[PDB]
Paper text:
Human αβ T-cells recognize antigen complexes formed from MHC proteins bound to diverse peptides, CD1 proteins bound to diverse lipids, and MR1 presenting small molecules. Although the four types of human CD1 antigen-presenting molecules (CD1a, CD1b, CD1c, CD1d) are related in structure, CD1b has distinct cellular and immunological functions. As compared to other human CD1 proteins, CD1b shows particularly strong recycling through the most acidic endosomes, use of a particularly capacious cleft to capture large lipids, and it is uniquely expressed on a subset of activated macrophages in the periphery.
Next, we determined the crystal structure of the CD1b-PC–BC8B TCR complex to a resolution of 2.4 Å. The TCR docked centrally with an approximate 110° angle across the antigen-binding cleft, where the TCR contacted the lipid and CD1b. Specifically, the main chain of Y36α and P37α in the CDR1α loop and P108α in the CDR3α loop form hydrogen bonds with the phosphate. In contrast, TCR β lacks interactions with PC, and instead contacts the F′ portal of CD1b (32% BSA). In fact, the CDR3β loop penetrates the F′ portal to gain access to the CD1b cleft, where L111β contacts the buried L154 on the α2 helix and L111β amine backbone and E80 on the α1 helix.
Author numbering:
A (entry chain D): 1 to 181, 183 to 187
B (entry chain E): 2 to 245
C (entry chain B): 3 to 99
D (entry chain A): 3 to 278
Write the structure that this text describes.
Amino acid sequence: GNSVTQMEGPVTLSEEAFLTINCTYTATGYPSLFWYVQYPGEGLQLLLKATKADDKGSNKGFEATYRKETTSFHLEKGSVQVSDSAVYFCALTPSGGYQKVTFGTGTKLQVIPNIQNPDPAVYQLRDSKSSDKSVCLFTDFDSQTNVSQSKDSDVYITDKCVLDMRSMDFKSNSAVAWSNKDFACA
Amino acid sequence: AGVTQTPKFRVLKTGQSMTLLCAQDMNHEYMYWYRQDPGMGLRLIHYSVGEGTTAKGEVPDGYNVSRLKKQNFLLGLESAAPSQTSVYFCASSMPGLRSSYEQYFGPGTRLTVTEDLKNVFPPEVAVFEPSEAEISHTQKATLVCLATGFYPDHVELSWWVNGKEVHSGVCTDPQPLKEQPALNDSRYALSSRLRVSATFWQNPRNHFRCQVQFYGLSENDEWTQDRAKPVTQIVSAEAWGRAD
Amino acid sequence: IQRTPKIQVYSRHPAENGKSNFLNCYVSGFHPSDIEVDLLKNGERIEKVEHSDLSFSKDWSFYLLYYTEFTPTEKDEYACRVNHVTLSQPKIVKWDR
Amino acid sequence: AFQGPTSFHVIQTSSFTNSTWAQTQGSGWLDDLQIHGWDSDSGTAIFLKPWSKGNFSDKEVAELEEIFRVYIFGFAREVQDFAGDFQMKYPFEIQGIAGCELHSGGAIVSFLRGALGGLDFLSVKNASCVPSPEGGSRAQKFCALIIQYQGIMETVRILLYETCPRYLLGVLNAGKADLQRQVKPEAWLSSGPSPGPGRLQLVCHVSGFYPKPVWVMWMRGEQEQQGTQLGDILPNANWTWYLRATLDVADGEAAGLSCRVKHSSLEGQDIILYWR
Ligand SMILES: CCCCCCCC/C=C\CCCCCCCC(=O)O[C@@H](COC(=O)CCCCCCCCCCCCCCC)COP(=O)([O-])OCC[N+](C)(C)C
Ligand SMILES: *[C@@H]1O[C@H](CO)[C@@H](O)[C@H](O)[C@H]1NC(C)=O
Ligand SMILES: [Cl-]
């Protein structure tokens, strides 16, 4: 009658923040414990594991100590990178790996970047083709800025997304808005 | 190449049958078939402890499996239902006390079961030129690509510059949006941004292209409509750089 | 180690011509387990021969019981041919009447 | 005549020919009686008696079967993985026996002994690995390694000291109509291979008795012929026993001899057979 209980829901953290994803289990015996990471659009992959009590899993700056007394396997990282944005699954299987694995529901991690010079502005973009279609581009806002939901049936506002121009080491947040209407930007 | 899966994407009518193939050339004894839905997490359908042996998982109804050869784990849908709309993942592992008995997962298989194949629409792809106000104020140029009216949400968006795939200064929406969130078989929309230097956009020899790879109807899929058959195809849009 | 099988051949009931009986062949004290045991009737193998599942003694040496239902006549001669790795030739132990 | 404790034990015989080939034979016994078989191909337990499941529910039986199936599977894979390190030369064999026995006083003793090449290798005492002197450095290495796997030691401790004693008492009661019965032997005399020129071998056959303790002796009226060679107590397929008691005598010193048989089923009416 094994079970895995991990962090309730989505966790948003700024770039270089301390991360802690709590995980506790209930099992009879001496099971092995794992952390699986699932990157957007990908399958699950082992992050780290600890086959026996008091073992310590270490990978990509992340670490987790198997504490039998507190029946836990808490995930920790000193300085979260933007590339850590993924779903983290705590896992458990009887030792030997001869039996099925028990996964938690998974915790979503959203690592938001630190914008050094926030310059929020709304731009109107013209379609390259003859069509006089237009889109609205909300960009250069800070990470704490929330994207206002549509609350209009025919107006579409995307979620915020981060783009990195790696050559110039400039990151920027952006949301796109559009409508098939008269529709003014922002 | 580890754990592979075929198909990558599939759209089925209700009642239609299909087989998902999972292969591993790692000599792994154990193989697993899961489905992943939002809020539900990973749910095991069926699993195999060795060549010739299969067992039921948490969600086994509507599915059958087979392990004739140790290399492959076949997942079958005898009568597709809309509830079977999910992303299917195959895993494999090697038991043993000294073994690295963790699970190895395949890339995923997106499945969408619709009541009617005339709900399948390819995307419309449009490229929006950077704003002059952004160019003068930041000395940066953001192109926007918008793919609209596609169903199912089985698309791959990519940016091309002088016929080369770009990844830097690029950002695409994590998931396509529902154009009509209140209806089941609503069409989707996906937005992407390509930010470049103002000087780069200002060169008239630079060619920008937004490619959207759509997965839709196959050759064996019946089509009896005036509309063009919404087959697997590439829909693209372009913009050329410009001085003044 | 490498131990030679002890062979003992016996009948369930006293030998009485023209009436049903059981022929037994108990092979014990051998190692390794691999062994070939045959119950013979006038020098040729009996096809219908039942045997126990492999068991072993406290000393780890193996033992098996081979048996068959038979009806002996005045002219009939019975035996038990056993072949093991410790044997250079199959040892035949006859059933004394 | 000699009798020991009533025991339930499971046995294993594993032959490791090469690094890619290994075959395991397993069974379950209540003393000399086989109550369990193992179908190695399907990986299931075969119940040879209607009471072979004891007083254990169909859920608990399916849990133990699963433990043994995973064990028989894992055992050959783990030995073949560790053989390199232990310095094993192919081919070799392994034997195992585990279970529990009821003594006089209601004391159930649980046991687990392993062997390598028909020789003692290990034993279990107070839920702990005890390497055998015959096992050598390999047994000490095996016990030092197996301790590091607390899940295995916990599973072995549960099975030996909790699951087994109650399984035993349950199977003894469930099969008492077969276990607790009296079957009378039949006795006959014959003449054996001549032990010399002026010698005779008088054979006394005793067969069809249950339970196993028996007494057979050659007599001169009440004079116990001390030179009586006692054979082994041999099995009969129908859960009965066979025993033959021989006597080497000079041609003439065989005239007034008889065979006396004592068994628990005979109700004080010993079988006596005069040589003739
Ligand atoms: C009815 C009673 C009959 C009479 C008694 C019968 C006697 C039977 C005695 C012994 C025979 C059966 C032993 C079973 C032990 C397997 C251990 C196991 O299952 O758990 C581990 C799996 O470990 C594995 O992965 C299985 C691999 C077993 C092969 C190991 C070979 C070397 C061990 C050589 C061994 C030689 C031993 C010599 C002693 C030193 C996992 O541990 P866990 O994570 O804690 O999960 C268990 C709890 N749970 C299942 C609830 C989740
Ligand atoms: C291993 O032994 C088995 C039995 O003889 C045989 O079938 C198998 O081919 C052998 N393989 C090798 C090359 O070790
Ligand atoms: Cl591969």
